[PDB]
């Protein structure tokens, strides 16, 4: 049944790789992807949370933890070495540029005007532009790692759609400081700059690049399921708010 | 949270203008197959009944003869749906179906024919393609404006009532200057859509645009847009 | 005293001409201008409201009514004929393009969804673009009328500042229909399009052109007093929101 | 090799305003260096006067006709197709119809009688003219590709003038009305018709050599891979 | 509603960084003459006291030595005002007074001198002019952030507390590439201003920009901006 | 008059990359038609090899030097000022340093070792080069106005190349890194230094005649009132 939803937005037997694992949106996407039948490899530097995700939110048992710092270079060689031997191909890459980036936690409070003052006092404004570089840097090297596996997913033909790299990001603790939009757009500008350039140079291969920018769990499920599935095989270069 | 529950259009009372032709057709099919009462409007009942009795997979396609350009015919079709069902949740207006000439007479495949088409089309008809789309999206929403809010009050679906606006370029699609007519139509629906989105989204009605390419793409969009997936989709325009 | 406020934002003995008279903002500006000592001619097609303004809000008695339809062409020749003989020169022109434009009143209500429906039903969408043309058309011909008087205010030297044409507009009853911003930007686009072109061609003479776009009575007083006075003699081409 | 690079020898051009001005300044630079320039203007006395006066090699061919009426347009190419059967360059001056600043009083009445819709009308004519000018010469221009007398592709250089609106203080309004006019239509023709091997270019509105520089750089093989560009 | 009541700065506790020099000077004068307690900050007390004892018309100009680049000196001056007055309503930070070199040594009026200036200025100093302005506006607001809200709580003026940001291009003003340095400074203050305006206007603090030309113009702006006239002026940038 | 309009006779040019490429394609079109072209490159063996091989009239003068080091820059003009004392054209190739696509695996390691800050670095060098290239020749270029050997004003045409980054699949990144680089500095120089009688122009990054068309149209008197423009 061609346009029955169960066949259109089908991700059954899709081999995805999600950086950050739990993350924020990543979990919201990892849930929506495995639940509908997809091999979701989740990467993170804290294995206990990877293990929590793989066996508390997994509805069919396909979330596969893999410890590794995306920032860490050789750890990326390790993880590509692992998946190439276990599965040999991936179809989706959901890189969270800057999961190894901004501090995901702020010990100081943020409510009283004084708490806000010291938070600004210890935030050097160059850290906002650093958020940019972190996201630009990560998407570049994260895409670089899975480049063979990503096209390998084109040659194995387990899905009608093309291989895809969906890019996301987070601002970490900057979501709780009043100067959050500064960090948000600093992060958004990062992934879009790298994505547009990767799309121009590598969409000519079997990899389309897409962006989801940072709320309900159904908004992201809709997107990730429409984007990676057969329903969204002819969508490349877009940025979804 | 599985696809069958998220991208469900079950019990959606939609109204797709244009007469289930082209993008319109690909949308009524994808909506009815997955369970929606789709009223289809057009000025030629002969073609309206064919789709209902040829492409409907569950038999929930209800034809309705009417000129969208005619205001009184628009008043009638709203009058019909208000008593038969009393509420609509989706409106897929194809701005400019009562617009550009759908079928082209003269040959379009020769340097002379290309010249012949260029001489006999006044360039203001490109500006007219724009103007028609502004008129259609505006007046189609006005017709179903109460009916659409009834779709929030009957609460048969969690999503907000929605007006998806699209258009066609008619016979201009096989003239070498199609992009001109295309963007003329694209600009029409978007300009009016942002004016309606700004003015009426505060009334619980989302506005969205699908632009004038497999039936798999249109099904994806129309189903992602109208379902609970994509309940927080307002102001977007889809290429 | 050069930078004492009473001398900086001084409009004392300034000869202004305000189209619409009461208007909405026009009154708010006519009050701020005469109160601080300026000959304010007010123009409108309904003399009773011109007479009400001139002798209820006038604090020094300088609001001078003058009946006339700005849309009406020969009425403009009449009013320039009158002021050239009475005073012979003007320094400020506050034209409200489209005071002879959109309907300033809507008999139908606007609350119930049905009232909104019929209001849209009887509003042809071409009336929004007509709001544009009305404002573009009016500023052109309104400026045209006072062109001699405006430079006459440069030769008489009653103020250190240059002669000025401040342009405004209103959407009339469209302020009460839900599709108001459509009319607002339709009106704003009108005055700015004509203003930019008049500024390019005629700022090379002694007339700078400025725009105030459509709340408290002090916001407008601040603007009109800062703009037309000596404090704002080197401001041309700006658009004040 | 300036003489070989910028060769316009044997170029079949057609300029719709080669007597009005600029057209003239450019028909001269084109014929002098060896291009058969057909000249269009609605007052023929001046077109032939321009010829046998400004032809430095004697290759300037006048023909009476105004660009606004299309009945004149089939007339012109029907003749032009019979002499040569093919054109390579078209320098259309969209808006051939086109349209005492002393004392402010004269200026007041000067604009007092200029309806501002005439500026928007300056726009509309220019959009229509390039469209109908291209529509007229569409076969002949590609025929110039089949005769293969030049290495470059067929070209339509689009321009316009504001005429008497050049004198009113509100000239920039008319200039931009024309500037926006010719470019808007040019972008629609370039996307839709460059895929038929025809480049479109625009020169926007005064020296005898700056314009000559342009017309010769674009019409020569030097300007063979320049399409969609605009030039002041 | 007369000018003397609208454009009043009476009882305004302002703080103007840079040291009452240039636009800063023209602003402290226009503010004190019309009645405002203006604290002036700079790193050279000798020039700070001159303006206080030469250009003050009512004697309400209070000098304060301090490096705006030095954070601890910024902590001191805030500590001083918090006990002496306890509240500020206006902050006129001149971002990059502790920035570009104010005075130029070498001759600037010769093709050789122009070349000499071009060879000895690394082009990253233009990017540095930008970066300094981002740092100054950011950290100056951070210093007085509590103090500024006190100016809303003491209620000595109806307007909201305000941070007006400006800057200087230093010695680059008489180098032929001044516009480069000018816009480098202009971009600095505006980029940071919109980030502060977005983040902190919800705390009752307006942000505005005056860009780096008679003393009559600056008096007009600074007085229109800070007074009750212009109480609803936020997000603007003034050329 | 093609031969007189596009006259480059007796033009004192200086191209900083007239051996690398494009520079060569343009030094040729300039010297051949009579312009004394000084050529810069950091490997002199190839610069003199280009001369006495590509000089069609024998007017190509090499000089060893890399544009990045300014110590080389005073060296070059100190010599160039002594031979002639004045320059009219400067075609600077900002970024003279500049910088096996088979199989995806080679490509993975190819980018794996390219730090993305090197693309931003491609930008920075080009901004610095035009600045320091102009700073070097600033006196000599205006001296070319005082010698009055040409009717046109002195000109600095700015270009750059991405070198080996032209081969990585992410070349457009490097191209735009260079394209944005040269134009950003060019706009700052044009506003600040055109008031000193020096026009600035940019050609952005391959035929022997399309580039020749440009370099000759701009360097001639034809391109005398073209300043601030950019050309593909």
mmCIF file with all atom_site columns, N, CA, C and O in Angstrom, chain A residues 161-181:
data_model
loop_
_atom_site.group_PDB
_atom_site.id
_atom_site.type_symbol
_atom_site.label_atom_id
_atom_site.label_alt_id
_atom_site.label_comp_id
_atom_site.label_asym_id
_atom_site.label_entity_id
_atom_site.label_seq_id
_atom_site.pdbx_PDB_ins_code
_atom_site.Cartn_x
_atom_site.Cartn_y
_atom_site.Cartn_z
_atom_site.occupancy
_atom_site.B_iso_or_equiv
_atom_site.pdbx_formal_charge
_atom_site.auth_seq_id
_atom_site.auth_comp_id
_atom_site.auth_asym_id
_atom_site.auth_atom_id
_atom_site.pdbx_PDB_model_num
ATOM 1  N N  . UNK A 1 161 ? 14.964 5.260  0.195  1.00 0.00 ? 161 UNK A N  1
ATOM 2  C CA . UNK A 1 161 ? 15.453 6.618  0.336  1.00 0.00 ? 161 UNK A CA 1
ATOM 3  C C  . UNK A 1 161 ? 16.975 6.649  0.273  1.00 0.00 ? 161 UNK A C  1
ATOM 4  O O  . UNK A 1 161 ? 17.654 5.632  0.443  1.00 0.00 ? 161 UNK A O  1
ATOM 5  N N  . UNK A 1 162 ? 17.507 7.839  0.023  1.00 0.00 ? 162 UNK A N  1
ATOM 6  C CA . UNK A 1 162 ? 18.942 8.049  0.053  1.00 0.00 ? 162 UNK A CA 1
ATOM 7  C C  . UNK A 1 162 ? 19.432 8.145  1.492  1.00 0.00 ? 162 UNK A C  1
ATOM 8  O O  . UNK A 1 162 ? 18.669 8.430  2.419  1.00 0.00 ? 162 UNK A O  1
ATOM 9  N N  . UNK A 1 163 ? 20.728 7.894  1.671  1.00 0.00 ? 163 UNK A N  1
ATOM 10 C CA . UNK A 1 163 ? 21.356 8.096  2.970  1.00 0.00 ? 163 UNK A CA 1
ATOM 11 C C  . UNK A 1 163 ? 21.270 9.566  3.359  1.00 0.00 ? 163 UNK A C  1
ATOM 12 O O  . UNK A 1 163 ? 21.280 10.458 2.507  1.00 0.00 ? 163 UNK A O  1
ATOM 13 N N  . UNK A 1 164 ? 21.207 9.819  4.664  1.00 0.00 ? 164 UNK A N  1
ATOM 14 C CA . UNK A 1 164 ? 20.916 11.152 5.167  1.00 0.00 ? 164 UNK A CA 1
ATOM 15 C C  . UNK A 1 164 ? 21.797 11.469 6.366  1.00 0.00 ? 164 UNK A C  1
ATOM 16 O O  . UNK A 1 164 ? 22.091 10.590 7.179  1.00 0.00 ? 164 UNK A O  1
ATOM 17 N N  . UNK A 1 165 ? 22.213 12.729 6.470  1.00 0.00 ? 165 UNK A N  1
ATOM 18 C CA . UNK A 1 165 ? 22.874 13.244 7.666  1.00 0.00 ? 165 UNK A CA 1
ATOM 19 C C  . UNK A 1 165 ? 22.019 14.380 8.211  1.00 0.00 ? 165 UNK A C  1
ATOM 20 O O  . UNK A 1 165 ? 22.008 15.483 7.657  1.00 0.00 ? 165 UNK A O  1
ATOM 21 N N  . UNK A 1 166 ? 21.298 14.105 9.285  1.00 0.00 ? 166 UNK A N  1
ATOM 22 C CA . UNK A 1 166 ? 20.531 15.121 9.990  1.00 0.00 ? 166 UNK A CA 1
ATOM 23 C C  . UNK A 1 166 ? 21.407 15.719 11.083 1.00 0.00 ? 166 UNK A C  1
ATOM 24 O O  . UNK A 1 166 ? 21.976 14.989 11.903 1.00 0.00 ? 166 UNK A O  1
ATOM 25 N N  . UNK A 1 167 ? 21.528 17.044 11.095 1.00 0.00 ? 167 UNK A N  1
ATOM 26 C CA . UNK A 1 167 ? 22.382 17.753 12.040 1.00 0.00 ? 167 UNK A CA 1
ATOM 27 C C  . UNK A 1 167 ? 21.499 18.494 13.034 1.00 0.00 ? 167 UNK A C  1
ATOM 28 O O  . UNK A 1 167 ? 20.478 19.082 12.659 1.00 0.00 ? 167 UNK A O  1
ATOM 29 N N  . UNK A 1 168 ? 21.897 18.458 14.305 1.00 0.00 ? 168 UNK A N  1
ATOM 30 C CA . UNK A 1 168 ? 21.218 19.156 15.386 1.00 0.00 ? 168 UNK A CA 1
ATOM 31 C C  . UNK A 1 168 ? 22.283 19.775 16.282 1.00 0.00 ? 168 UNK A C  1
ATOM 32 O O  . UNK A 1 168 ? 23.487 19.631 16.042 1.00 0.00 ? 168 UNK A O  1
ATOM 33 N N  . UNK A 1 169 ? 21.841 20.472 17.325 1.00 0.00 ? 169 UNK A N  1
ATOM 34 C CA . UNK A 1 169 ? 22.778 20.970 18.315 1.00 0.00 ? 169 UNK A CA 1
ATOM 35 C C  . UNK A 1 169 ? 22.068 21.349 19.594 1.00 0.00 ? 169 UNK A C  1
ATOM 36 O O  . UNK A 1 169 ? 20.839 21.412 19.657 1.00 0.00 ? 169 UNK A O  1
ATOM 37 N N  . UNK A 1 170 ? 22.869 21.582 20.630 1.00 0.00 ? 170 UNK A N  1
ATOM 38 C CA . UNK A 1 170 ? 22.359 22.067 21.902 1.00 0.00 ? 170 UNK A CA 1
ATOM 39 C C  . UNK A 1 170 ? 23.290 23.146 22.435 1.00 0.00 ? 170 UNK A C  1
ATOM 40 O O  . UNK A 1 170 ? 24.480 23.187 22.111 1.00 0.00 ? 170 UNK A O  1
ATOM 41 N N  . UNK A 1 171 ? 22.730 24.025 23.268 1.00 0.00 ? 171 UNK A N  1
ATOM 42 C CA . UNK A 1 171 ? 23.503 25.087 23.895 1.00 0.00 ? 171 UNK A CA 1
ATOM 43 C C  . UNK A 1 171 ? 23.874 24.754 25.329 1.00 0.00 ? 171 UNK A C  1
ATOM 44 O O  . UNK A 1 171 ? 24.483 25.587 26.013 1.00 0.00 ? 171 UNK A O  1
ATOM 45 N N  . UNK A 1 172 ? 23.544 23.550 25.797 1.00 0.00 ? 172 UNK A N  1
ATOM 46 C CA . UNK A 1 172 ? 23.879 23.145 27.151 1.00 0.00 ? 172 UNK A CA 1
ATOM 47 C C  . UNK A 1 172 ? 23.260 24.063 28.186 1.00 0.00 ? 172 UNK A C  1
ATOM 48 O O  . UNK A 1 172 ? 22.087 24.448 28.098 1.00 0.00 ? 172 UNK A O  1
ATOM 49 N N  . UNK A 1 173 ? 24.062 24.423 29.192 1.00 0.00 ? 173 UNK A N  1
ATOM 50 C CA . UNK A 1 173 ? 23.571 25.263 30.277 1.00 0.00 ? 173 UNK A CA 1
ATOM 51 C C  . UNK A 1 173 ? 23.152 26.643 29.791 1.00 0.00 ? 173 UNK A C  1
ATOM 52 O O  . UNK A 1 173 ? 22.431 27.346 30.507 1.00 0.00 ? 173 UNK A O  1
ATOM 53 N N  . UNK A 1 174 ? 23.589 27.052 28.598 1.00 0.00 ? 174 UNK A N  1
ATOM 54 C CA . UNK A 1 174 ? 23.186 28.346 28.065 1.00 0.00 ? 174 UNK A CA 1
ATOM 55 C C  . UNK A 1 174 ? 21.685 28.448 27.828 1.00 0.00 ? 174 UNK A C  1
ATOM 56 O O  . UNK A 1 174 ? 21.194 29.554 27.573 1.00 0.00 ? 174 UNK A O  1
ATOM 57 N N  . UNK A 1 175 ? 20.952 27.335 27.882 1.00 0.00 ? 175 UNK A N  1
ATOM 58 C CA . UNK A 1 175 ? 19.505 27.406 27.810 1.00 0.00 ? 175 UNK A CA 1
ATOM 59 C C  . UNK A 1 175 ? 18.868 28.032 29.032 1.00 0.00 ? 175 UNK A C  1
ATOM 60 O O  . UNK A 1 175 ? 17.689 28.400 28.985 1.00 0.00 ? 175 UNK A O  1
ATOM 61 N N  . UNK A 1 176 ? 19.626 28.157 30.125 1.00 0.00 ? 176 UNK A N  1
ATOM 62 C CA . UNK A 1 176 ? 19.110 28.639 31.397 1.00 0.00 ? 176 UNK A CA 1
ATOM 63 C C  . UNK A 1 176 ? 19.595 30.037 31.779 1.00 0.00 ? 176 UNK A C  1
ATOM 64 O O  . UNK A 1 176 ? 19.063 30.614 32.736 1.00 0.00 ? 176 UNK A O  1
ATOM 65 N N  . UNK A 1 177 ? 20.591 30.581 31.083 1.00 0.00 ? 177 UNK A N  1
ATOM 66 C CA . UNK A 1 177 ? 21.060 31.961 31.254 1.00 0.00 ? 177 UNK A CA 1
ATOM 67 C C  . UNK A 1 177 ? 20.169 32.884 30.428 1.00 0.00 ? 177 UNK A C  1
ATOM 68 O O  . UNK A 1 177 ? 19.701 32.477 29.353 1.00 0.00 ? 177 UNK A O  1
ATOM 69 N N  . UNK A 1 178 ? 19.878 34.109 30.887 1.00 0.00 ? 178 UNK A N  1
ATOM 70 C CA . UNK A 1 178 ? 19.040 35.011 30.077 1.00 0.00 ? 178 UNK A CA 1
ATOM 71 C C  . UNK A 1 178 ? 19.585 35.299 28.686 1.00 0.00 ? 178 UNK A C  1
ATOM 72 O O  . UNK A 1 178 ? 18.800 35.645 27.794 1.00 0.00 ? 178 UNK A O  1
ATOM 73 N N  . UNK A 1 179 ? 20.892 35.180 28.467 1.00 0.00 ? 179 UNK A N  1
ATOM 74 C CA . UNK A 1 179 ? 21.474 35.357 27.133 1.00 0.00 ? 179 UNK A CA 1
ATOM 75 C C  . UNK A 1 179 ? 21.495 34.036 26.365 1.00 0.00 ? 179 UNK A C  1
ATOM 76 O O  . UNK A 1 179 ? 22.507 33.622 25.798 1.00 0.00 ? 179 UNK A O  1
ATOM 77 N N  . UNK A 1 180 ? 20.332 33.380 26.328 1.00 0.00 ? 180 UNK A N  1
ATOM 78 C CA . UNK A 1 180 ? 20.213 32.077 25.688 1.00 0.00 ? 180 UNK A CA 1
ATOM 79 C C  . UNK A 1 180 ? 20.114 32.177 24.168 1.00 0.00 ? 180 UNK A C  1
ATOM 80 O O  . UNK A 1 180 ? 20.792 31.424 23.459 1.00 0.00 ? 180 UNK A O  1
ATOM 81 N N  . UNK A 1 181 ? 19.290 33.097 23.646 1.00 0.00 ? 181 UNK A N  1
ATOM 82 C CA . UNK A 1 181 ? 19.154 33.221 22.195 1.00 0.00 ? 181 UNK A CA 1
ATOM 83 C C  . UNK A 1 181 ? 20.497 33.497 21.526 1.00 0.00 ? 181 UNK A C  1
ATOM 84 O O  . UNK A 1 181 ? 20.741 33.038 20.404 1.00 0.00 ? 181 UNK A O  1
#
